[PDB]
Amino acid sequence: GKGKPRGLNSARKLRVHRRNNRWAENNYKKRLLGTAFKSSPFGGSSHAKGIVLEKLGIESKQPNSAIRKCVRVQLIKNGKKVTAFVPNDGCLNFVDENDEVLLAGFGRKGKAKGDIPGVRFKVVKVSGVSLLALWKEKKEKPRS
Amino acid sequence: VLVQDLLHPTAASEARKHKLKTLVQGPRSYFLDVKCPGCLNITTVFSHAQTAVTCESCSTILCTPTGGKAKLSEGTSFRRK
Amino acid sequence: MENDKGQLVELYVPRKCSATNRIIKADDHASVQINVAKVDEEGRAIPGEYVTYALSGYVRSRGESDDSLNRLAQNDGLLKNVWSYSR
Amino acid sequence: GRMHSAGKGISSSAIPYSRNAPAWFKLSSESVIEQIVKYARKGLTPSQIGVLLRDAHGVTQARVITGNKIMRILKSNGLAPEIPEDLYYLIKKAVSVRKHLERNRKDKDAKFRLILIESRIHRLARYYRTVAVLPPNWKYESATASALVN
Amino acid sequence: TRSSVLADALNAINNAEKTGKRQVLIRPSSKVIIKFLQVMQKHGYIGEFEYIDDHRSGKIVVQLNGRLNKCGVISPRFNVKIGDIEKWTANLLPARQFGYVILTTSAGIMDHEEARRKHVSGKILGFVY
Amino acid sequence: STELTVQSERAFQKQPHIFNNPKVKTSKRTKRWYKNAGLGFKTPKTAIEGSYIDKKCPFTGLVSIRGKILTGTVVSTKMHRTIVIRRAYLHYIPKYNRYEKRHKNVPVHVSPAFRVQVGDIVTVGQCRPISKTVRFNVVKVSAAAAXXXXXXXXX
RNA sequence: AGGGGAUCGAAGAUGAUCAGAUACCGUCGUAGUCUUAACCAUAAACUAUGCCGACUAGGGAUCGGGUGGUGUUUUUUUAAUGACCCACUCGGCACCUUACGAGAAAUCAAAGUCUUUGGGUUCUGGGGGGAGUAUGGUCGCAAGGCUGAAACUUAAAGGAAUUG
RNA sequence: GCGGUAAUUCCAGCUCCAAUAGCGUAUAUUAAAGUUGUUGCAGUUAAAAAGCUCGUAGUUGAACUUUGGGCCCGGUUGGCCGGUCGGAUUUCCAACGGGGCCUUUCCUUCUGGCUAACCUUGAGUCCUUGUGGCUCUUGGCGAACCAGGACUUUUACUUUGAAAAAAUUAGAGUGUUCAAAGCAGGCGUAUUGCUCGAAUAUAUUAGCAUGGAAUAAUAGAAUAGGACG
RNA sequence: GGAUAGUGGCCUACCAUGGUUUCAACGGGUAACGGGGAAUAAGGGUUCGAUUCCGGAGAGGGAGCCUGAGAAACGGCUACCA
Ligand SMILES: [Mg+2]
Ligand SMILES: [Mg+2]
Ligand SMILES: [Mg+2]
Ligand SMILES: [Mg+2]
Ligand SMILES: [Mg+2]
Ligand SMILES: [Mg+2]
Ligand SMILES: [Mg+2]
Ligand SMILES: [Mg+2]
Ligand SMILES: [Mg+2]
Ligand SMILES: [Mg+2]
Ligand SMILES: [Mg+2]
Ligand SMILES: [Mg+2]
Ligand SMILES: [Mg+2]
Ligand SMILES: [Mg+2]
Ligand SMILES: [Mg+2]
Ligand SMILES: [Mg+2]
Ligand SMILES: [Mg+2]
Ligand SMILES: [Mg+2]
Ligand SMILES: [Mg+2]
Ligand SMILES: [Mg+2]
Ligand SMILES: [Mg+2]
Ligand SMILES: [Mg+2]
Ligand SMILES: [Mg+2]
Ligand SMILES: [Mg+2]
Ligand SMILES: [Mg+2]
Ligand SMILES: [Mg+2]
Ligand SMILES: [Mg+2]
Ligand SMILES: [Mg+2]
Ligand SMILES: [Mg+2]
Ligand SMILES: [Mg+2]
Ligand SMILES: [Mg+2]
Ligand SMILES: [Mg+2]
Ligand SMILES: [Mg+2]
Ligand SMILES: [Mg+2]
Ligand SMILES: [Mg+2]
Ligand SMILES: [Mg+2]
Ligand SMILES: [Mg+2]
Ligand SMILES: [Mg+2]
Ligand SMILES: [Mg+2]
Ligand SMILES: [Mg+2]
Ligand SMILES: [Mg+2]
Ligand SMILES: [Mg+2]
Ligand SMILES: [Mg+2]
Ligand SMILES: [Mg+2]
Ligand SMILES: [Mg+2]
Ligand SMILES: [Mg+2]
Ligand SMILES: [Mg+2]
Ligand SMILES: [Mg+2]
Ligand SMILES: [Mg+2]
Ligand SMILES: [Mg+2]
Ligand SMILES: [Mg+2]
Ligand SMILES: [Mg+2]
Ligand SMILES: [Mg+2]
Ligand SMILES: [Mg+2]
Ligand SMILES: [Mg+2]
Ligand SMILES: [Mg+2]
Ligand SMILES: [Mg+2]
Ligand SMILES: [Zn+2]
């Protein structure tokens, strides 16, 4: 009866064996090791607000050919440096260095999105006023 | 095959099987009385000997053992029971 | 396979092997029906009158269709000797 | 099937259905018991005695004509040895294997056969010791076993 | 080494039915085997069986028809708790209308509907449809 | 446990409030007190015939047995007048629907009215805190020795 | 660490070859190859297939044991022996044909009796890289062995079969 | 995967789709996932059997010991009638369960207290030709359990039951106008009150308490230091 | 024996060498208060519970104590540290 002990008093062996093999599950390991809190630029939190250091033009990967307009950002709770994408046509016009941006994840559990190499985040707000509203023109950036 | 009498197997194809693989297992060995005319009385012997059996009085022989049944010695007789 | 009150519902009560009693289902185009003719006085095989036997595909593939026919027909009076029940 | 090899061979006595009889067997319980004890006096083992009785005499099974196993007959008349005989012959063997290995330290095969024998010794001895026929704390050991068997 | 004698007899019965046989020599037979084979026969999944007495543990020659799909043994005799006879039969029975899960209770080896009317329970032995 | 000496302490060993008047000439020297614990546990003769003191005796001491009554098998008899017993039991794990062998070792005071040995099964009554760890007292020896003399010499 | 050191021959030196040729081929030939006393513990250490038990199908060979014979050949005076022939049965190493059945298939008498899912038990695996790497513990004279992660990266990597 | 000049994925206009006082995004987690597999995975070639054998902890472990027959007692569904003024119970009947008996058959055990039950019978009879029926004390039931003494092989499993907060869940009742809720409310003489409620279920593992005696263990009598008196 | 409202190595004196552990002691982690409970609806499960009820703990960190039936209290005192 391949493998597992079938008997009626081997619940100890079965429990332990499960414990051990949960560790081969990449998300159990992450949750138990605390990777969230230990690695990762966010705290494990959903978002994180940082400061714009410089404006980058990341060249996209194959078989695409573009320049991917990003920003290096230094997280306020970490000082950790993080290169983040500025989505939508324009928008890199909206940032400028030293501004205060709200970075969010990319929706890939870590992992960089499409062809933007090694960018695991995206800009959601600048100066407290959100890209989307600025792009459409519902809002306007604050004074300074 | 497909349907057969497992309870009443023919003593022909039962005689052929292994002593343990019969319907109710039993031995295939037998005993026999043996004589050597120098004496007048007989000795009871098992067909598979191990011990090279000697007669009642005369230090003679009877059978030397083997891988199975014993080899009774030269001029001897034997009724079976 | 009746229903609530009486009424035999559900079509098609399939055949059945006389040797195994396993169902003979539709797509078994390897099962068989052997009609055996009832004779009468002095030869004469009486058309339209049979002792019939159904044999499932499994048995015929296994090579048990001959031996099982013998047993079936003999204990049905149209054979004597031939088959032994012991072995 | 076989503990210390992979051999699977079935092979045994096929004991008869007839738990009594042979009917053709005359003699008496008296007779064979006295035969058992006289051979036990001669120093034979219950195995040895059963075989000798089974061929040279007419004793199909010593337990049928006397409702008693040979070892109990030897025990009752106060003839049981110190250790059982299967444990004896195992220890005896381990002794001879070891003696051969003291002489030929280059025979790694013998070392491997010594382990198997000794492990068999120890598990058997543990059984006997559970069922109180060996004094609880009875243990095999090479230094004392050579002295034990002889 | 032989671990469940119930298992061997049952499986052997199953290989027989599948191989299109009508009879089967099982070894080595026991009270628990008799009572499983007796509930199997109480509902006609087998015909009559026969205990042959070797002077050892026994042998059984089961005569079987062919209304048997499968008869299995639940290898750890799990303890069933009057509510759980529900979930067991649910797990391994082709329908509610038929099939039996047979188990051991302190009111005897009995199928689940018997055990339900008698309103007793215990450990689970096997099943048969 | 104990054995010998009786009077083997810096303090005089006496039963409290059990006066034996020296004016009254007695043919038993010391007057002894005893009781029965209840729950049908016979106060064995070794407790009434005895001469020991043990104020933690349930039969000749100042302790009442009440609450739990449990049984275990004696695994340690090295502490003076107290033992340690193992209590095995199977724990039920749902998810797997089977059990697993567990155990706990209860420390329990043992009156010198009992001669206890490792291996014996003992029946033990709950009582007030006797020591840092002892919450139980031996109230019945349901064993003997386990065929100890039946391991004697040869014929 | 001794011995041994014929043969072949990691290293190295050469002759040729080549654009190059630290190779392939030729020559010389150190270590080794052999043995003793110790280490080392790894191989595609392979049947790439845990062990014990049950059950499920036909066949001719063959190795060991055994049983049966008014079988053959061995001559002598018939035997006894021995080898040989036929039938059987155990336990082997294998092949053949089947395929009820299994598989993703190649194939498989188990890799079968598995969604109609439970005989007992041991071990391992959880996408690919990162990597058998880093770190600690341990073993070794050493080379190394055992134990053995993570950050990050990535949409395939992979298997069997078909057609080109 | 789209975009390098007719872009069905970009920027827009048009039209169109889905959800709609809401809809998108990020992080987590649950389902899908039989990708953690007790149920329920896989490990020849895809990830994966330790080079091999011993072996302790652990898990597992062949069969066998009261089975069979006979008798009584009373239940709860279901039929065929209903007798009746929708439900009723007796006989006819099966079906399915419960209790106690006799078969060689401890039920712990003495010593009374107690008796409900017939081997009784003491009378006869209501009434269908009579074992259809119970009142009814004078030889003759133990166990139904009191209480005192004397002792007892250990467990696992299952059954039922007690002890069991509320809110939560499941769920009955009630027309918050519906609904989420709430535990209200509903009737008249609405001039001097009448009244239904505020259920039931789960509540497990451990401990307690009772019934079971299959399946699993455990103990016993072999240097008899055995059992009854 | 002292101490306590009181049992107790709670504490002290003398005496012993014991106690726990692969059925995982001891140690480490916890982005750990525990429970009633919550989310996920074939089942078996998985995940969660700082948070309306119950229990515990704290009142910047420690210790100490007065009053009192009850506090080692902090919208009490006392000392140190911050
Ligand atoms: Mg791994
Ligand atoms: Mg990864
Ligand atoms: Mg940079
Ligand atoms: Mg075998
Ligand atoms: Mg083994
Ligand atoms: Mg043999
Ligand atoms: Mg004391
Ligand atoms: Mg001590
Ligand atoms: Mg103590
Ligand atoms: Mg050389
Ligand atoms: Mg070179
Ligand atoms: Mg060159
Ligand atoms: Mg070179
Ligand atoms: Mg060269
Ligand atoms: Mg390797
Ligand atoms: Mg190979
Ligand atoms: Mg391998
Ligand atoms: Mg074959
Ligand atoms: Mg021959
Ligand atoms: Mg097949
Ligand atoms: Mg094919
Ligand atoms: Mg992986
Ligand atoms: Mg290191
Ligand atoms: Mg060295
Ligand atoms: Mg190293
Ligand atoms: Mg490793
Ligand atoms: Mg390392
Ligand atoms: Mg791509
Ligand atoms: Mg266009
Ligand atoms: Mg699109
Ligand atoms: Mg458009
Ligand atoms: Mg939605
Ligand atoms: Mg599912
Ligand atoms: Mg996975
Ligand atoms: Mg289960
Ligand atoms: Mg399922
Ligand atoms: Mg998988
Ligand atoms: Mg592989
Ligand atoms: Mg291997
Ligand atoms: Mg190992
Ligand atoms: Mg068993
Ligand atoms: Mg009966
Ligand atoms: Mg009854
Ligand atoms: Mg309950
Ligand atoms: Mg105190
Ligand atoms: Mg010490
Ligand atoms: Mg110690
Ligand atoms: Mg552990
Ligand atoms: Mg915390
Ligand atoms: Mg928590
Ligand atoms: Mg909480
Ligand atoms: Mg918190
Ligand atoms: Mg409390
Ligand atoms: Mg604060
Ligand atoms: Mg304070
Ligand atoms: Mg306050
Ligand atoms: Mg500080
Ligand atoms: Zn002679």
Which nucleotides of strand I lie under 7 Å from a protein CB?
A: 1, 7-10, 14, 16-24, 31, 43-48
E strand or H helix at F40: none
Structure tokens at E17: 């039915």
CA pair distance D37, D75, nearest whole angstrom:
10
CA pair distance C74, C76, nearest whole angstrom:
5
Pick the CATH number of C1-87 from 3.60.20.10, 3.40.1410.10, 3.30.1230.20, 3.30.420.10: 3.30.1230.20
Q: Could you state, in order of their start, the residue ranges of all structural domains in chain A?
A: 1-144
CA pair distance A129, D56, nearest whole angstrom:
113
Which nucleotides of strand H lie under 7 Å from a protein CB?
A: 1-4, 10-11, 25-30, 35-43, 49, 53-56, 58-65, 96-98, 150-160, 205-206, 211-216, 220, 222-225
Protein CA F47 to sugar C1' I82 (Å): 65
Give C7's contacts (C-beta < 8 A, 6+ positions apart).
Answer: none
- Choose among D71, D13, D65, D62: nearest CA to D44: D71
Given a contact cutoff of 8 angstroms between Cβ atoms, the answer to whether A92 and A82 are in contact is no
DSSP code of residue F23:
S
Protein CA D22 to sugar C1' G148 (Å): 72
Given a contact cutoff of 8 angstroms between Cβ atoms, the answer to whether A47 and A103 are in contact is yes
Omega cis (within 30) before A63: yes
Give E49's contacts (C-beta < 8 A, 6+ positions apart).
Answer: E37, E41, E60, E61, E62, E63
Using a CB-CB cut-off of 8 Å, the residues of chain E touching D19 are: 55
Question: Residue B77, SS3?
Answer: strand
Alpha carbon C79 to chain centroid, angstroms: 15
- Choose among E22, E115, E13, E128: nearest CA to E74: E128
- Choose among D116, D140, D117, D143: nearest CA to D128: D140
Q: How was this structure determined?
A: X-ray
CA-based Rg of chain E, rounded to a whole angstrom? Answer: 14
Q: Which of residues 7-26 of E touch strand H (CB under 7 A)?
A: none
Given a contact cutoff of 8 angstroms between Cβ atoms, the answer to whether F109 and F130 are in contact is yes
Could you say which residues from 4 to 63 on chain D have a Cβ atom under 8 Å away from some Cβ of chain E? 15, 17, 19
Total count of residues recorded for chain A: 144
CA pair distance F137, F65, nearest whole angstrom:
8
Phi then psi for A53, rounded to 5 degrees? -90, -65
CA pair distance E10, C73, nearest whole angstrom:
31
- DSSP assignment of A83-140, as one string? EEE--SSS-TTT--TT-EEEEEE-SSSSS--SSSTT--EEEEEETTS-HHHHHHTSS-
Structure tokens at C59: 């048995």
Phi then psi for F79, rounded to 5 degrees? -80, 140
Provide the resolution (angstroms). 3.2
- Choose among F138, F135, F145, F9: nearest CA to F81: F138
The count of other CB atoms within 10 Å of the CB of residue A135 is: 16
Mutant choice from C59, C66, C75, C87 vs B, greatest count of B C-beta within 10 A: C87
The pocket of ion ligand 9, defined by CB under 5 A, consists of F 82, 109, 134
Give the Å distances, CA to CA, from F24 to A81, D48, F28. 100, 78, 11
Strand partners for F16: none
Phi then psi for E51, rounded to 5 degrees? -85, 110
Q: Where are the alpha helices (DSSP H) in F23-91?
A: 45-48
